[PDB]
């Protein structure tokens, strides 16, 4: 179709097939099998890489297990490495690294899989390429006897920042709770201290949620197992690269909560079979809306929302029921349910 921006011709000494690797101006990478004796072009491969036109380069003998393989890195809006393993063609991205051009690199120090390159920021840098996603290892798994007293309970994400993630663990014996906060890809320190976590005492979280009642602050709501609902305030320091947690108040609830989410501006909990919508007040949480559910809904274990209008409610034994928000009525109205008994975990 479009004008070629780069092209490279490679023979794999393993198979003996000739491959023609072509990059285009619209960010599309193509690959060709060249017939040897005649020269016919077979087995057409195509993948859209990015916005920039595709630049190619070639890496002679890189190791897969960390058997020889050759790979062609593909340069565009992002980088892609394009290899063949066990006669399966693979094209995957590279871990957080834009490259303008790329070449192999060998020392006594860096014996295998070394690579030197010019980054898009403009710096020249030496590296290793390590874990190629084959079909038996699609994911690269990054991290005396090593046993913790704390058990992980829930992982949360901030509403406005997609990159920040909050972690909550429970102590196995002492009714404590620790909280970690990893912004972007690194953990933050607690206040001005040395540690990377804050331990809350006399709390174990059944469920939790991070909710922005207003658009400039973020709040952690914990549901404790003692029928309490606790509000904290998350204060990330940004330059000291630290967070803080800070109690606001404690609110009493009738029943345990297993599902809670942000519904437009408030906190939407399910306690037992009751759907309760809460607003932030400065002495306690304030319940703005209370809806009772149909009779066969016994516990709610899961809910989800579609653009602050519809509500999908999941019962422990029955199934899904769908509700619509009545703004004038200030309640949720049920309008569909299911024919069989489904024991919902997540919806």
């Amino acid at each position: 179709s479009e004008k070629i921006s780069d092209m490279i011709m490679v023979r794999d000494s393993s198979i003996g097939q000739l491959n023609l690797h072509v990059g285009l101006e619209n960010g599309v990478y193509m690959k060709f099998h060249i017939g040897d004796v005649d020269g016919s072009f077979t087995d057409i491969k195509r993948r859209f890489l990015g916005l920039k036109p595709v630049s190619l380069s070639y890496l002679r003998e890189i190791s897969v297990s960390l058997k020889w393989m050759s790979c062609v890195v593909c340069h565009s809006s992002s980088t892609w490495v394009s290899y063949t393993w066990k006669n399966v063609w693979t094209i995957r991205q590279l871990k957080d690294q834009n490259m303008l051009s790329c070449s192999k690199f060998v020392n006594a120090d860096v014996a295998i899989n070394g690579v030197c390159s010019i980054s898009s920021s403009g710096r020249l840098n030496i590296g290793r390429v390590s874990n190629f996603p084959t079909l038996d290892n699609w994911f690269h798994v990054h991290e005396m006897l090593q046993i913790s007293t704390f058990r992980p309970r829930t992982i949360l994400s901030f509403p406005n920042n997609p990159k920040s993630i909050l972690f909550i663990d429970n102590h196995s014996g002492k009714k404590q709770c620790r909280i970690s906060l990893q912004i972007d890809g690194e953990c933050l320190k607690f206040g001005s201290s040395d540690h990377l976590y804050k331990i809350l005492d006399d709390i174990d979280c059944v469920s939790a949620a991070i909710i922005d009642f207003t658009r400039q602050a973020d709040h952690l709501i914990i549901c404790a197992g003692d029928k309490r609902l606790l509000t904290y305030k998350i204060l990330v320091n940004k330059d000291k690269l630290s967070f803080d947690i800070e109690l606001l108040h404690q609110t009493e609830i009738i029943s345990p909560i297993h599902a809670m989410l942000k519904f437009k501006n408030f906190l939407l909990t399910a306690m037992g079979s009751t759907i309760v919508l809460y607003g932030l007040g400065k002495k306690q949480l304030l319940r703005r809306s209370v809806t009772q559910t149909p009779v066969s809904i016994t516990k709610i274990v899961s809910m989800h929302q579609w653009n602050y209008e519809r509500l999908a409610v999941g019962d422990i034994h029955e199934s899904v029921t769908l509700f619509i928000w009545d703004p004038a009525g200030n309640v949720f109205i049920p309008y569909v349910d299911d024919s069989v008994k489904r024991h919902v975990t997540v919806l």
Partner: peptide, 27 residues
């Protein structure tokens, strides 16, 4: 054949909708 309104003095937590709408008329 128990909702809440926040009294501006903040201690209105233990009240009601219907109590707060009466105090719209007293206020």
């Amino acid at each position: 054949q128990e909702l809440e309104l926040e009294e501006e003095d903040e201690e209105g937590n233990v009240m009601s909708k219907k109590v707060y709408d009466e105090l719209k008329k007293q206020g």
